[PDB]
Ligand binder design. Sequence first.
Ligand SMILES: Nc1ncnc2c1ncn2[C@@H]1O[C@H](COP(=O)(O)OP(=O)(O)OP(=O)(O)O)[C@@H](O)[C@H]1O
Ligand SMILES: Nc1ncnc2c1ncn2[C@@H]1O[C@H](COP(=O)(O)OP(=O)(O)OP(=O)(O)O)[C@@H](O)[C@H]1O
Ligand SMILES: Nc1ncnc2c1ncn2[C@@H]1O[C@H](COP(=O)(O)OP(=O)(O)O)[C@@H](O)[C@H]1O
Ligand SMILES: Nc1ncnc2c1ncn2[C@@H]1O[C@H](COP(=O)(O)OP(=O)(O)O)[C@@H](O)[C@H]1O
Ligand SMILES: [Mg+2]
Ligand SMILES: [Mg+2]
Lengths: 247, 247, 247, 247, 62
Amino acid sequence: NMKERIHEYCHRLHLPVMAERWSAMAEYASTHNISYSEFLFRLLEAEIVEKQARSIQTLIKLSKLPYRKTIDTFDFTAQPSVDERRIRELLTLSFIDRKENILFLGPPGIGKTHLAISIGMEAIARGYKTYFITAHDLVNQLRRADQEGKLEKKLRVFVKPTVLIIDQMGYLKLDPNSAHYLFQVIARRYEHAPIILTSNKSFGEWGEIVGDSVLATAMLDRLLHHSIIFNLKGESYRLREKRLQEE
Amino acid sequence: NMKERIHEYCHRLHLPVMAERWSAMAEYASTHNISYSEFLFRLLEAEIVEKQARSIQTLIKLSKLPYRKTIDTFDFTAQPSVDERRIRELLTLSFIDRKENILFLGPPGIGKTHLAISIGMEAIARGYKTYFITAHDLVNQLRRADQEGKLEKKLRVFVKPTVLIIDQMGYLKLDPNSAHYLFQVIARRYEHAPIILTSNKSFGEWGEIVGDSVLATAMLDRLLHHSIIFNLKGESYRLREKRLQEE
Amino acid sequence: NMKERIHEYCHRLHLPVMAERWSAMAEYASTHNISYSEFLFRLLEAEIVEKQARSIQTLIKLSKLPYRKTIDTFDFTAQPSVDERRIRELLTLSFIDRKENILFLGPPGIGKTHLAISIGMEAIARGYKTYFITAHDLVNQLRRADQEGKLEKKLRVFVKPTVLIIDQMGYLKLDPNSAHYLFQVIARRYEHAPIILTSNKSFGEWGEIVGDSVLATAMLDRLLHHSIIFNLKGESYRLREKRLQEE
Amino acid sequence: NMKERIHEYCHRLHLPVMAERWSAMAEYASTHNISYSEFLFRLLEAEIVEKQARSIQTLIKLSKLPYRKTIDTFDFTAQPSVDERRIRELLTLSFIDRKENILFLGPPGIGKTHLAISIGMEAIARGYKTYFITAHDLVNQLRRADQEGKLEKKLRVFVKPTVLIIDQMGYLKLDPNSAHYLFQVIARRYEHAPIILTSNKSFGEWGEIVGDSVLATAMLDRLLHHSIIFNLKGESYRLREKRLQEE
Amino acid sequence: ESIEELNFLLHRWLDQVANRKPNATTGISPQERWAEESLKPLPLKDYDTSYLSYRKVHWDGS
Ligand SMILES: Nc1ncnc2c1ncn2[C@@H]1O[C@H](COP(=O)(O)OP(=O)(O)OP(=O)(O)O)[C@@H](O)[C@H]1O
Ligand SMILES: Nc1ncnc2c1ncn2[C@@H]1O[C@H](COP(=O)(O)OP(=O)(O)OP(=O)(O)O)[C@@H](O)[C@H]1O
Ligand SMILES: Nc1ncnc2c1ncn2[C@@H]1O[C@H](COP(=O)(O)OP(=O)(O)O)[C@@H](O)[C@H]1O
Ligand SMILES: Nc1ncnc2c1ncn2[C@@H]1O[C@H](COP(=O)(O)OP(=O)(O)O)[C@@H](O)[C@H]1O
Ligand SMILES: [Mg+2]
Ligand SMILES: [Mg+2]
């Protein structure tokens, strides 16, 4: 007949949602005298919406985020030091065009990673690729790749993503000789793509963390040229905020 | 608007034909008030037909066939040695399921290559993959691959195709190296995929052709285990066409 | 011999067509040396086509349709009240899956029975089973069945068909007994199988038609829960044909 | 394509074996230049043979025989009193045309039921229907049917089969009033179909077994008119024959 | 017939007997030991456990 042939052709053209809903769309267009062009547009638009949803699902899967969070679950009353409007502006993703780097600095547990992942999620929503990594982990992976000789592959893996979320810069300290990998990543992404950094160590401690003063100075010179630095002043939310607000 | 968005969605869902013919088909439906289901079916049918056409063109391109020939072009009155019944039954492509190898033997210009090319074309048309190679070129490429150490790559390339058409066999004499290359090719495609071969020398002569009686006998024994022979006899069609052109 | 044994086997395996056409098809194959597979395929295809033809004839016979009508016979220019789009979409037979009941309302001779007969014919052609009964005859048969105690038999006979076309509704007035018979028929085929009904009275008038306002309202409420209405308006095609015959 | 369509059409026409072997038959006809008519005849003949085999399977299933035995497992040296040639003649099934009744009489365990079932199996092989029952069981079933009022159905069930194997006539004695059921069966099958009887009680004991002298006399008068009575004189095979031959 | 009803019945049953009957080993009503328990305080805001998906709004706004 024709219904089975339509189903088969929709499946062969990779249009599952179209195969599911074509009968209902046809009936609705029938009951409202919808033009043929608008009927086709409705079908195509539904298919596009579903495909974009699945694409966003795949991108969030490959982002390698430890978890999923958003600005909705964030309270700016507990963080009054920094302006709320600036974060909302960042949510517009105007920094992706400017290629500016976003830095969150503050004591542990003050919500750095939360905000970074929220911004990354906003970027992933609108199609931009995003990769989440810990600085020490990134350096270790680059070192292993260099030892194996195929360093450029991993370097491209780290440089291609539009948004790079490097977290826990100061949490762990690898052999200083490997800091050149971090410098390579930061310089290659320089003036090309934004970088989202989050850490609890001042800018002076970088020389100690990487075990090199001039290398850290150059890394910061490039990472801070086009950037918007947010310094979060407060106390560990999970413990201090609840303890001080339950009183 | 709507038309541009329809075009964008069509080209984002990999729908080339619909991008152009949707307006014409909408015009046609309006001129006859065709049902929405039938309109969608017409769009999908046209898309599928063109997709299959492009796929078949690509398959023919990959096959490396020197030129396109069909049994419909092959006259049988001029070739009374064989009967249409056997040839068309072969064209049904049952030997692939039976893994029977097909061998054509006859004087130059009889047509033993036209039939092989037609069989390959039909196999391509029915979704199978075919590779057309001349025995001399096959041997040369295999020798080069062995020299570069990539012999496994070329062996996989020559074994993967469902139907392998080996042409220009017997006319050129072979050394023991080429003999073992041919034996390896046959063994890899023995009881695994049909081989279509055209030659002008009897089986016994293969010992002299390859310069190794034992190896030639082994090749013949393995090939004839699943084989269909075609002894073609007749005046060269090239010569007859030349005579007709003269007169 | 062989021919007589072939005939006997054909008539013992329920192969009517092959019994006669096998000789003609053998002649045709010999005149063109058709392949055995294609010869068998031609035989089987002819047998299947004739089998389907006989099956459709039997289905039409069982349907009790007074005469065969098709939408191709139904002119739409003469009936501008409705549009070809809706009618053909109904002809796609999606309401059966949706279990939507179809109701036609209009003046005498408009064509509300021609469309129902065409829908039934298409449903038969697509493998569905259709029963065409006039409301008066339905009521009379149900009353007789109840008198003889076989009401369940006739109810099963009238509910089993996938599509039930109830004709001649409204013109004849109904008593409460006939009212409850109609209500039972609707209830049994409510959300279970489509009902195609043609009438000439508005829904409100059904209270007077059946002589029970509450029962008529219940019937209308249950029917309209899954219904498609067709208000047909125009000069009687019978009268127009008579006028054309006169001139 | 065509192979799948051929398979589908063969299944829709109820030709499973034809669907399985059509490719092989086509290939064989190809390699031997078999005529199209002979190809069709081969396919039809194979299908007919398989269908007849399945029909014989169903008939043997419905025969309700306690087990399956044949003359092959029968030794005529242990039963020299009766002629072997007569049993072989019976195996020709000439009695089915003459409508003569076959009676086996002898002591228990002398092979009565074995021979009766063997002859019944021979009859089933050539398409003739056969029903096996024990006389007392038949009478009890007829009595139950008569009590339920639908006696004619069971009577037709018992009379329709071409061969009726009534065994264990004297094993059990039901209420004499029910012997009229046995008389009904024997008289209705009289001069219409053969009856195969096997029992170890002389013809004089029938009046005692059925509890009626004249009724038994009439039953025997009808059952013995056209018959071939075999009297087996000997001893119980299973015990006596082995005991006397192991010495 | 409803999981809410089942949960309500379960909580009532627990608070009636399950957390009231003395244990066969501790030999004391569980609620007294609960009163003896010293658990760490709960955070004011609970870890949000809700499915988070990203979707796109159609052309019209549906
Ligand atoms: N039966 C035929 N009908 C039509 N054209 C034919 C026929 N046989 C051969 N030809 C023509 O033969 C030409 C190709 O050469 P042909 O296929 O005969 O060579 P071959 O069998 O490969 O011989 P060789 O031994 O040289 O490899 C084409 O022009 C094809 O049209
Ligand atoms: N649009 C049409 N095109 C062609 N013939 C038509 C059309 N409408 C009605 N007819 C003709 O109408 C005749 C049948 O009567 P019609 O179907 O109009 O009655 P109806 O709708 O059942 O009316 P009633 O209320 O009397 O039951 C047939 O000759 C059919 O050809
Ligand atoms: N301002 C805040 N609003 C809501 N939740 C917060 C806030 N600050 C911290 N949290 C909670 O604390 C955790 C984030 O701590 P994080 O910033 O990752 O610490 P660190 O940067 O030391 O890893 C999250 O589970 C988050 O829910
Ligand atoms: N002449 C014989 N040859 C082979 N087997 C026999 C013979 N006579 C009896 N038997 C065996 O004995 C059994 C048949 O006994 P049967 O005639 O049924 O006794 P009854 O008639 O008392 O029921 C079968 O299992 C069969 O194998
Ligand atoms: Mg050639
Ligand atoms: Mg009508």
